[PDB]
Amino acid sequence: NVDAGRYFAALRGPELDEVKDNEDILLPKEEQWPFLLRFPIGCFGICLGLSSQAVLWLALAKSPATNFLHITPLINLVVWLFSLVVLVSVSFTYILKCIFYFEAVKREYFHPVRVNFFFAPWVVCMFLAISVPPMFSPNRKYLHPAIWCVFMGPYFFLELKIYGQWLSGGKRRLCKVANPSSHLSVVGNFVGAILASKVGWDEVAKFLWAVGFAHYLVVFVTLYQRLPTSEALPKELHPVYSMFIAAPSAASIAWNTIYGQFDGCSRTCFFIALFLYISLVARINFFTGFKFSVAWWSYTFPMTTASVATIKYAEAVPGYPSRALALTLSFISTAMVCVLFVSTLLHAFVWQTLFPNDLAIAITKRK
Amino acid sequence: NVDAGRYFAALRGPELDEVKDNEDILLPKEEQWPFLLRFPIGCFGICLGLSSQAVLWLALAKSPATNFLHITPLINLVVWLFSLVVLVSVSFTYILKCIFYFEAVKREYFHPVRVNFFFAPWVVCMFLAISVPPMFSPNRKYLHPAIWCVFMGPYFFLELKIYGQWLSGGKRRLCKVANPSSHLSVVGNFVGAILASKVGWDEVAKFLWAVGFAHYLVVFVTLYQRLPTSEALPKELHPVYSMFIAAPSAASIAWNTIYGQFDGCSRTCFFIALFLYISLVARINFFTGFKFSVAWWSYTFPMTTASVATIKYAEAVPGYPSRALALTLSFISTAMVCVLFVSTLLHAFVWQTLFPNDLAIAITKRK
Amino acid sequence: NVDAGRYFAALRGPELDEVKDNEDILLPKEEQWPFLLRFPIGCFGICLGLSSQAVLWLALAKSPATNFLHITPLINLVVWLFSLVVLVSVSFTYILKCIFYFEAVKREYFHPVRVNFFFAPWVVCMFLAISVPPMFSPNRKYLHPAIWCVFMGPYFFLELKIYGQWLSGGKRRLCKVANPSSHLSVVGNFVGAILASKVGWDEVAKFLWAVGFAHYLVVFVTLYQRLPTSEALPKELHPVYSMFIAAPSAASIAWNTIYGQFDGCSRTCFFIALFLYISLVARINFFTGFKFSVAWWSYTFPMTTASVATIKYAEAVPGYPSRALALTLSFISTAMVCVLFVSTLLHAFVWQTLFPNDLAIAITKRK
Ligand SMILES: CC(C)CCC[C@@H](C)[C@H]1CC[C@H]2[C@@H]3CC=C4C[C@@H](OC(=O)CCC(=O)O)CC[C@]4(C)[C@H]3CC[C@]12C
Ligand SMILES: CC(C)CCC[C@@H](C)[C@H]1CC[C@H]2[C@@H]3CC=C4C[C@@H](OC(=O)CCC(=O)O)CC[C@]4(C)[C@H]3CC[C@]12C
Ligand SMILES: CC(C)CCC[C@@H](C)[C@H]1CC[C@H]2[C@@H]3CC=C4C[C@@H](OC(=O)CCC(=O)O)CC[C@]4(C)[C@H]3CC[C@]12C
Ligand SMILES: [Cl-]
Ligand SMILES: [Cl-]
Ligand SMILES: [Cl-]
């Protein structure tokens, strides 16, 4: 199939889903495509945004810190049930695409940007597994190991192949193909540590942490040098950079679980995430220039994971300065989801513009 | 204004302040320029060299180790007072340049090498703040927080903008623009930790350490790969490389303050700094080939900060081998300052060659 | 002498010892060269493979874990004596080459790949020093310091020059010259820590660890970016990549010695090494496609050092899952040595093809 050199020279845009002014495609543009062909793999971001909020709201209802508010536990029950409904629908609809349009899927699997989104279905399931409502699992001492193996099996199996082609001469190297959204494949390992520690296997959790950190360091520095991938890193500051915060925030939570309390290895990761958050939200150009797009839902994923981590920090350092920080980050992140949630409905049933023709999968081979 | 691609293709030299044999300038060469236009931003290195010695001499007079010598405390009093006099003069003179020659300053602010020297004024003030003579501050329990905020405010505010343009598509990236003297912008955070810990705020000090380390790692590796910046890294070994030692040495001192005693996180940073020091001074080509230049004063900054760190190491591991190391590094560094101090006076009033025409700010736009 | 730009444009092959289909050489091909000229520096891999096995077998005979097997100590005595015999022969034969063919040696010293093999003679001696049979050294409390200085002297002295030319403008930089086998120069420091800790000097061991880690991180990331060195990184997966495991495995053992027990700093390094091992041996393409070559002996070096580290891990976490892992890795690594040992003899006296003409040292200057 087409390489990424032909995917970086015909598609331009921060997410790279936009045809340039010279390229030619193989399908009619004005004509309406079949619904299945117009269903991109970027719709899984909806599950990521909703699932993360379920984890965050549980912390506000069970954590010893932030207790005076008296947050009822029904928020997690309502959010968790609704989140699962969407996941069972997007996954079911996508499967039909593979059976009837397996040819189109292979095009996305080679897309430089959409490759890393294949991990979303497994990551989303993990969040709903480590934040199950207390009502459904009363007297829960330790989760059965089967949950970890089933959901951490397919991820790890596909983990080896992608990670193994970065140190090679094949075209798909970390240098030839890379982008700000490349962290989505290295965040599962950190998130998987929490699930493992909740089933009884503690040594295994340490294994995932080492794997996650080693690749994150490589994937972090590589996005500061001159890499063949051009037109992907947006000029100035763009929301696509929010994925930088997903990794450090998740890593900090993992350490607090295996080793019980914040060591020097938990605060430092948290402080790195906080620095990036300030440099991406403490700007008057962030709350003024906003355009609704499907990719936005995926950008709330790292702005909500930080809120979960910050609450844990406030638990080990009680005080007014810490409470304000924890109770303010969780408000900005939750506010964005509410705005996005209302906006999506209007574009679905009022304007009918959520699923336009996907011109990024119709680039002709060669020139 | 001119970019750095036009600043890396018309200026050649280790510090990059020297016109090539083909470029044309916009100002007369033989004619003497106004004094203000001939006052470069590189003169702030004088304050850095003198201020650091004040910190080092205090350690030799208060530290439990190195006590048999019976070093009087008057050395700090004399050095500290003289250091402040120079700072109040260079800063005052430079300010007049901005009012009358703000146009010239903007040229320096875009210079690939002189950009990182804007942090010197704030870093110099910190050294004189964490090494105040005991006489002036008797019964000193903890410094007022106002000192940290006032001096760490302007640095952090300008910290976000430069650090934020490295991960972007703008011309000023860590790859397009970089050089051995790029560590001067990542050393303030480590130095700022010491000041914060001396006013009562200890958690804040941890925040700066994480920020400092994250950027240092990125700025360390990036100077080993092939980066568009050419003609800046001198062939063979050059004194400009001494800035590599400023970062690790300052970081080690910070850890000893927040966490009290040398953990594994303090010795390892110290040993990295020691290795670089040996590879840059254990050479017969270092003490034989010496040419007086203004940039030399800034090269003593990292050769004196190590002496402060080594004394702390000798405090936790008493013994003859440690005492010799601490009492020998502080002698080489102090000897260079004395030689430079005498040499500067001769070039100021005997030869009158300290401030020649600055041809590096007269490069014509384009070709 | 010839640079590496002329060594990367006339030699092609995973180890780079194979002339391309267009280059011209300066010596007859059909004619048989003198035996000395046909003796490459790659023969030292034999000592590395045999010496490592001596260390591993000692652990199986003294370590509290893996005791039920009742492994006799005579295995170490027989292997150690035989290993020393080979070392005293290869070293003696090579020395004669320098006296009579010093001109040829300089060509190898500038070879991009064969430069890092000059460290083998010193590394091999260390293994036979930290694994001396108990019979030869009864009532051994601490080894004399002279052993460390004699064997760690020449390595460190040559350590400074190579490490010092990576951060420079000279042709031999980490970017212009690099390859998967570049870890052989950064593994001595980690191995040298164990020897130092066995003579009484413990603080010195910490110094080597910091030096080893700092260069390994630089040498690790640099092999993921686009570096002028092309045709050296084999396409797909190749055994040359096994050198990635030598560094982390050796580092983990060092920490367990200086600080007594596995901290968080030992398990994490071990887990990184384990991940790389799985991605290079858990493949049906590894045990099926095998071709005998001299470079193979050097590839068993990192597959045996891991077995030594894993046994130590099983000592701190007793249990059936740990015992199986330790007793299975040491079987695959030892099996390969037995297969290679038998194969080498046949190619030496039955087929007579171990030392063919070395065409890689006859590349004409320029084109
Ligand atoms: C990969 C780059 C972009 C930075 C982000 C990765 C972090 C996970 C790394 C960077 C440095 C590492 C730290 C290096 C120094 C220390 C201090 C060290 O201090 C202690 O002595 C622990 C016990 C204590 O005194 O509390 C604990 C480990 C830790 C935090 C390390 C944990 C992991 C850190 C934060
Ligand atoms: C960025 C690159 C060029 C290296 C320089 C950065 C250092 C600040 C990093 C590199 C590795 C880190 C270390 C990784 C391993 C350890 C060992 C670890 O050992 C312990 O178990 C601490 C308690 C003890 O046993 O003393 C303490 C943290 C520390 C020193 C880390 C502190 C920070 C270090 C030295
Ligand atoms: C260079 C890249 C490719 C990774 C391989 C280098 C490792 C040697 C570095 C990476 C991160 C470092 C670790 C960063 C975080 C920690 C956790 C920290 O946890 C503790 O709090 C120690 C005490 C304890 O709780 O057991 C101990 C140091 C350690 C293991 C560091 C040791 C050295 C590590 C494993
Ligand atoms: Cl949680
Ligand atoms: Cl001090
Ligand atoms: Cl051992």
Author numbering:
A (entry chain C), B (entry chain B), C (entry chain A): 150 to 516
From the paper:
Slow anion channel associated 1 (SLAC1) is a slow (S)-type anion channel that generates anion (Cl- and nitrate) efflux on the guard cell plasma membrane and acts as a key effector of stomatal closure. Trimeric SLAC1 harbors N-terminal and C-terminal intracellular domains (ICDs) with the transmembrane domain (TMD) positioned in the middle. Multiple serine/threonine phosphorylation in the N-terminal and C-terminal intracellular domains activates SLAC120,21,27,28. To reveal the activation mechanism of SLAC1 unequivocally, here we report cryo-EM structures of AtSLAC1 with different phosphomimetic states: wild-type (WT) in an open state, 6D (T62D/S65D/S107D/S124D/S146D/S152D)29 in both open and closed states, and 8D (S59D/T62D/S65D/S86D/S107D/S124D/S146D/S152D) in a closed state.
Moderately conductive AtSLAC1 6D mutant adopted both the open and closed conformations. In contrast, the closed conformation of AtSLAC1 6D was observed in the conditions of a higher sample concentration and dense particle distribution. In order to achieve better resolution from homogeneous population, we selected two datasets showing mostly open conformation to determine the open state and a dataset featuring a large proportion of the closed conformation to determine the closed state structure with C3 symmetry, both at resolution of 3.3 Å. The closed structure of AtSLAC1 6D was well aligned with that of phospho-defective AtSLAC1 S59A31 with Cα r.m.s.d. being only 0.45 Å. AtSLAC1 6D open state was modeled with the TMD region (residues 182-318, 329-506) except the faint density of intracellular loop 2 (ICL2) (residues 319–328), and closed state was modeled with the TMD and an intracellular plug (residues 150-516). In the closed structure, the ICL2 lies down on the membrane plane, which hereinafter we call as “bent state”. Consistent with previous studies, in the closed structure, the long narrow constriction from the intracellular pore entry to the central gate is formed by hydrophobic residues such as F266, L333 and M392. The radii throughout these constrictions are narrower than radius of a chloride ion, which make it impossible for a chloride ion to pass through. In the closed structure of AtSLAC1 6D, F276 on TM3 adopts an unfavorable rotameric state (−83° of χ1, 6° of χ2) in a manner similar to those in the previously reported structures, F285 of BdSLAC1 (−91° of χ1, −16° of χ2) and F276 of AtSLAC1 S59A (−86° of χ1, −22° of χ2). In the closed structure, constriction of the central gate is caused by two sites: a triad of V272, V336 and F450 on the intracellular side (hereinafter called as “triad constriction”), and a quad of F276, V336, V340 and F450 in the center (hereinafter called as “quad constriction”).
